[PDB]
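queue> holo job accepted (KHU)
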Amino acid sequence: GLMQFTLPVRLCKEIELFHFDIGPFENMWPGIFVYMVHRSCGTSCFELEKLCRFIMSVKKNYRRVPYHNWKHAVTVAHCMYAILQNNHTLFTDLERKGLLIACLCHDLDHRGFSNSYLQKFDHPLAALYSTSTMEQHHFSQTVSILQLEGHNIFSTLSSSEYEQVLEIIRKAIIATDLALYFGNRKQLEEMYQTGSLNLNNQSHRDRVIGLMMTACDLCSVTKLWPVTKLTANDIYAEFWAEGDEMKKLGIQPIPMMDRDKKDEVPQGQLGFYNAVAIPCYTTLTQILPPTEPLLKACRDNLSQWEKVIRGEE
Ligand SMILES: CC(=O)Nc1cccc(-n2ccc(=O)c(-c3ccnn3-c3ccccc3F)n2)c1
Ligand SMILES: [Cl-]
Ligand SMILES: [Mg+2]
Ligand SMILES: [Zn+2]
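queue> job finished
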C-alpha cells in the first residue's frame, strides 16, 4: 500500500514530457508503466500483485518484431499518460484506468503485418474478423489475459463499472485501426468547427478517445529528431518484410513496402506527415489545447524530413 515506484531524477522529470523516450533498458519498462499508473490513476486503482502479473503476461504476448513490439506498447502508454496528466480534470477515474491498459495491450500478438497482407494471404484471422482484423485480435488477446487466474486487475470494480471499462478498452483498441482514423478526424473537425462538440455526449467522448489513441499510436513522429529518425528504420524494416511477402504471393507491393524503392522514403514520410500525422495532432490540439507540444514536435520532424530531401542530411 505504502510502496511507491520512484525513478531516477532524469526519468522522474523527463517522463512528464510528451517527447520522453523510455530508453534501451527493457527491465525498467514495467516499473515505468506502474509509476505512470500510480501518478495518473492512484496507488489504489490496481492491486500491485495482480497488475505486475498482468504486465508480464502482456509483455510475453508481444513478439520479437522490429517495431510492433513491447517497447511500442510502453511508448504508446507513456504518450497517453502525458495526455491524461496535461488534461487532469477532463477524464473519469474509469477512463484513466481503461486507457493506459488499452494502450499497453493495443498491439498484442502483432506479427508485423498489415490488415491488407492478412486478407491477401487469406489468414484465418481475416475470416474471423472481416474489418479491423488485427485490432479485433488485439482486443481478444486483452480479454484472454484478463481471464487468467490472478490477472483480473478490474476485480474490485462493480459489475457495471467492469462492463464500462472493457467497452472503453474495446473502442480504444479498435480506434488504432488507421483505416478508421480518417473518418473519425473529419467528423471531429466538423463538430469542433460548427461548435456542436459536446464532451458530455458519450458518442462524442468515444470519438475524442479514438483520436487520442491515433495520437498515442503515431507518437514516434513527436519525439526529438534522432529518436524519430531511428524509429523510422524499425517501422520500414517491417514494411519491407511485408513487401517481400507480397512479392512471394505474386503481388507487386506499394512503393512504401518495396525495399528496392528506399530512395522514395523521405518523400513518403512527407505525405504521411501531411495526410495523417499533422492533421491528427492539429485536431487533437483544437479539442485538447495542452496537447499542443505533440503538434509542435510533429511539425519540427516534418521540417527535418524536408531537409533530408533538400540533401542537407
Ligand atoms: C500514408 C497513408 O496514407 N497511410 C499509411 C498507412 C499505414 C502506415 C503508414 N505509415 C507510413 C509511414 C510511417 O512512418 C508510419 C508510422 C509512423 C508512426 N507509426 N506509423 C505506423 C507504422 C505502422 C503501421 C501504422 C502506422 F501508423 N505509417 C501510412
Ligand atoms: Cl516483421
Ligand atoms: Mg495496431
Ligand atoms: Zn500500435
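queue> The two ends are 52 Å apart (CA to CA).
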